[PDB]
Amino acid sequence: WXGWASNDGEGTAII
């Protein structure tokens, strides 16, 4: 979701 790498489903995801 609010990660900074891979997609977490809808947005960015944690490393």
Side-chain angles (χ1 to χ4, degrees):
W1 310 96
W4 53 99
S6 281
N7 290 158
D8 71 11
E10 292 177 1
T12 47
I14 280 120
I15 237 318

